[PDB]
Design a protein around this motif. Sequence first.
Motif, PDB file in Angstrom:
ATOM      1  N   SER A 255       0.795  -1.228   0.000  1.00 33.09           N
ATOM      2  CA  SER A 255       0.000   0.000   0.000  1.00 33.09           C
ATOM      3  C   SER A 255       0.832   1.285   0.000  1.00 33.09           C
ATOM      4  CB  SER A 255      -0.960  -0.019   1.199  1.00 33.09           C
ATOM      5  OG  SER A 255      -1.497   1.259   1.428  1.00 33.09           O
TER       6      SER A 255
ATOM      7  N   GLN B 123       0.657   3.840  -3.128  1.00 30.10           N
ATOM      8  CA  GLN B 123       0.186   5.213  -2.864  1.00 30.10           C
ATOM      9  C   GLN B 123       1.208   6.242  -3.367  1.00 30.10           C
ATOM     10  OE1 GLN B 123      -1.232   4.326   1.632  1.00 30.10           O
ATOM     11  NE2 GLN B 123      -1.533   6.475   0.976  1.00 30.10           N
TER      12      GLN B 123
ATOM     13  N   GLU C  22      -7.761   9.514  -9.583  1.00 29.94           N
ATOM     14  CA  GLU C  22      -8.591   8.343  -9.855  1.00 29.94           C
ATOM     15  C   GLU C  22      -8.108   7.600 -11.108  1.00 29.94           C
ATOM     16  OE1 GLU C  22     -12.358  10.554  -7.647  1.00 29.94           O
ATOM     17  OE2 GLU C  22     -12.614  10.010  -9.788  1.00 29.94           O
TER      18      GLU C  22
ATOM     19  N   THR D 247      -4.866   5.893 -10.175  1.00 27.38           N
ATOM     20  CA  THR D 247      -5.151   4.704  -9.372  1.00 27.38           C
ATOM     21  C   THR D 247      -5.543   3.517 -10.244  1.00 27.38           C
ATOM     22  OG1 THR D 247      -5.849   6.026  -7.412  1.00 27.38           O
ATOM     23  CG2 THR D 247      -6.510   3.676  -7.469  1.00 27.38           C
TER      24      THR D 247
ATOM     25  N   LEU E 221      -3.302   0.062 -10.791  1.00 32.25           N
ATOM     26  CA  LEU E 221      -3.898  -1.204 -10.377  1.00 32.25           C
ATOM     27  C   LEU E 221      -3.976  -2.181 -11.558  1.00 32.25           C
ATOM     28  CD1 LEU E 221      -6.801  -0.203  -7.837  1.00 32.25           C
ATOM     29  CD2 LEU E 221      -4.535  -1.222  -7.309  1.00 32.25           C
ATOM     30  N   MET E 222      -4.299  -1.676 -12.753  1.00 35.94           N
ATOM     31  CA  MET E 222      -4.198  -2.492 -13.975  1.00 35.94           C
ATOM     32  C   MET E 222      -2.786  -3.064 -14.126  1.00 35.94           C
ATOM     33  SD  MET E 222      -4.647  -1.482 -18.010  1.00 35.94           S
ATOM     34  CE  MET E 222      -3.458  -0.155 -17.840  1.00 35.94           C
TER      35      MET E 222
ATOM     36  N   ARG F  49      -2.088  -5.954 -11.587  1.00 35.37           N
ATOM     37  CA  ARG F  49      -2.783  -7.217 -11.824  1.00 35.37           C
ATOM     38  C   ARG F  49      -2.297  -7.885 -13.127  1.00 35.37           C
ATOM     39  NH1 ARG F  49      -3.929 -11.554 -11.583  1.00 35.37           N
ATOM     40  NH2 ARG F  49      -6.007 -12.501 -11.782  1.00 35.37           N
TER      41      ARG F  49
ATOM     42  N   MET G 241      -7.829  -5.140 -15.288  1.00 36.08           N
ATOM     43  CA  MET G 241      -8.006  -3.836 -14.626  1.00 36.08           C
ATOM     44  C   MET G 241      -9.335  -3.793 -13.866  1.00 36.08           C
ATOM     45  SD  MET G 241      -8.322   0.031 -16.190  1.00 36.08           S
ATOM     46  CE  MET G 241      -9.638  -0.489 -17.286  1.00 36.08           C
TER      47      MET G 241
ATOM     48  N   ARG H  74      -9.241  -5.953 -10.609  1.00 36.10           N
ATOM     49  CA  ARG H  74      -8.428  -5.443  -9.507  1.00 36.10           C
ATOM     50  C   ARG H  74      -9.015  -4.133  -8.941  1.00 36.10           C
ATOM     51  NH1 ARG H  74      -6.689  -4.891  -5.402  1.00 36.10           N
ATOM     52  NH2 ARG H  74      -4.558  -4.279  -4.819  1.00 36.10           N
ATOM     53  N   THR H  75      -9.485  -3.284  -9.854  1.00 35.36           N
ATOM     54  CA  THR H  75     -10.039  -1.975  -9.510  1.00 35.36           C
ATOM     55  C   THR H  75     -11.369  -2.118  -8.769  1.00 35.36           C
ATOM     56  OG1 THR H  75      -8.829  -0.967 -11.366  1.00 35.36           O
ATOM     57  CG2 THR H  75     -10.664   0.367 -10.419  1.00 35.36           C
TER      58      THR H  75
ATOM     59  N   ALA I 140     -10.604  -3.813  -5.239  1.00 38.60           N
ATOM     60  CA  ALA I 140      -9.981  -2.819  -4.348  1.00 38.60           C
ATOM     61  C   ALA I 140     -10.995  -1.797  -3.851  1.00 38.60           C
ATOM     62  CB  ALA I 140      -8.818  -2.107  -5.042  1.00 38.60           C
TER      63      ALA I 140
ATOM     64  N   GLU J 115      -9.739  -0.732  -0.027  1.00 43.83           N
ATOM     65  CA  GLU J 115      -8.277  -0.818  -0.023  1.00 43.83           C
ATOM     66  C   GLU J 115      -7.624   0.548  -0.157  1.00 43.83           C
ATOM     67  OE1 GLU J 115      -7.647  -5.261  -1.878  1.00 43.83           O
ATOM     68  OE2 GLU J 115      -6.494  -3.613  -2.778  1.00 43.83           O
ATOM     69  N   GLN J 116      -6.402   0.638   0.339  1.00 48.22           N
ATOM     70  CA  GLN J 116      -5.613   1.845   0.244  1.00 48.22           C
ATOM     71  C   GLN J 116      -4.435   1.407  -0.594  1.00 48.22           C
ATOM     72  OE1 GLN J 116      -5.612   5.112   0.861  1.00 48.22           O
ATOM     73  NE2 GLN J 116      -4.887   5.309   3.000  1.00 48.22           N
ATOM     74  N   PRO J 117      -4.370   1.811  -1.885  1.00 42.00           N
ATOM     75  CA  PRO J 117      -5.185   2.743  -2.675  1.00 42.00           C
ATOM     76  C   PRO J 117      -6.373   2.106  -3.396  1.00 42.00           C
ATOM     77  CG  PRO J 117      -3.309   2.038  -3.975  1.00 42.00           C
ATOM     78  CD  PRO J 117      -3.269   1.243  -2.689  1.00 42.00           C
ATOM     79  N   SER J 118      -7.405   2.907  -3.627  1.00 43.92           N
ATOM     80  CA  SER J 118      -8.535   2.444  -4.417  1.00 43.92           C
ATOM     81  C   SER J 118      -9.264   3.651  -5.003  1.00 43.92           C
ATOM     82  CB  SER J 118      -9.465   1.588  -3.561  1.00 43.92           C
ATOM     83  OG  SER J 118     -10.004   2.318  -2.456  1.00 43.92           O
ATOM     84  N   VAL J 119     -10.013   3.441  -6.077  1.00 42.97           N
ATOM     85  CA  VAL J 119     -10.901   4.468  -6.604  1.00 42.97           C
ATOM     86  C   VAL J 119     -12.169   4.431  -5.728  1.00 42.97           C
ATOM     87  CG1 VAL J 119     -12.188   5.215  -8.683  1.00 42.97           C
ATOM     88  CG2 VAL J 119      -9.988   4.024  -8.938  1.00 42.97           C
TER      89      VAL J 119
ATOM     90  N   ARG K  14     -16.980   6.460  -7.884  1.00 41.92           N
ATOM     91  CA  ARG K  14     -16.268   6.975  -9.057  1.00 41.92           C
ATOM     92  C   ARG K  14     -15.747   5.842  -9.938  1.00 41.92           C
ATOM     93  NH1 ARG K  14     -17.122  10.540 -11.554  1.00 41.92           N
ATOM     94  NH2 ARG K  14     -15.015  10.439 -12.471  1.00 41.92           N
TER      95      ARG K  14
END
Lengths: 194, 194
Positions: free
Chosen positions: A118, A122, A149, A152, A156-157, A160, B157, B160-161, B164, B169-173, B177
């Motif tokens: 994390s 971040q 956003e 993020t 994350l893409m 994974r 994507m 996982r997005t 999360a 989760e930290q980070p997450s959208v 949104r």
Amino acid sequence: GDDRELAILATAENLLEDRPLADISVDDLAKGAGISRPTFYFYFPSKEAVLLTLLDRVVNQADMALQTLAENPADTDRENMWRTWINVFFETFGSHKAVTRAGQAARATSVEVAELWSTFMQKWIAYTAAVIDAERDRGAAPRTLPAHELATALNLMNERTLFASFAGEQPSVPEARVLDTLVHIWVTSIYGEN
Amino acid sequence: GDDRELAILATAENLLEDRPLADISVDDLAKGAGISRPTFYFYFPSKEAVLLTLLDRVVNQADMALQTLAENPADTDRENMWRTWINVFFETFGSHKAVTRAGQAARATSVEVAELWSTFMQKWIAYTAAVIDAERDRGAAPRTLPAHELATALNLMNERTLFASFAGEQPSVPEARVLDTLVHIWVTSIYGEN
């Protein structure tokens, strides 16, 4: 002391290539490092703590490389800039597949592993958003989604997609096609009008 | 028989909201379902097998909805088409966060869970690629990345997005949104020139 620690860590990374952490014993790690079981326990409380250290080392390696990149004058073209950037993740984690795979599994059971990951994510998400903002500020990219956003989801893409590729998961993008794939999605979503 | 099975499954989903599967006991599940421990074992061999069934039910629910969507005449505009599509995943899995979260964790330890998820993903990735191909064939989208590779990254994507986001989760959208975020990335990467 640091030598025995290094040997424990080298052994653990070697054994993780062959089996999960659950099928590696403290006796396995001690033997490989040329130490006794109680000497092992002087350096690490658990085999999980060994993985945490290995993951910390690999993550730090990626972070240091990304920091060097960020410190150099930016890019050549925008697409190449992002290719070179994503490549740091591809090469660093791809050079430590066993630890990457083990660490990903451990996030679900270990708060330390989850926090390590994390913090890293971040940081480089925030960096990505700042870069997107600067591109917008200079008129190089359109003001579409909130930059943080967008940053993020793209990161994350990458997480994974890279990790599925490394592991040969079904489904996955072939490792030899993964960079081009991610770069296309980054460039289109960042610089594309919508 | 099906009633007791249903009650075991309802109990497990309720308890998974509060704690991981590792902190839920067979006695917990039996008690909640109003049955004895040996009666539990008539219906399921293990608490893991209970999760497998719950995950199967949630995944089947998403699959059936996606099949209905695919069977209706396509879209209104292209962006709305993809929004409605991704929304099926958002709503179905978002309505079963506890099971989703548990199932994701279980992929690392269970070959059955890993195979269930892989079959689902392969199917809707293949569908996505076929749609991208058809868009290219009709001149609606440019011939950029191999459609199957693009489809794979975009779906990974989403996986996982969404997950999360659901978990905070930290980070997450932010969950509110997440749809807009994914839709933007899909539309730009599929229809964008590059």
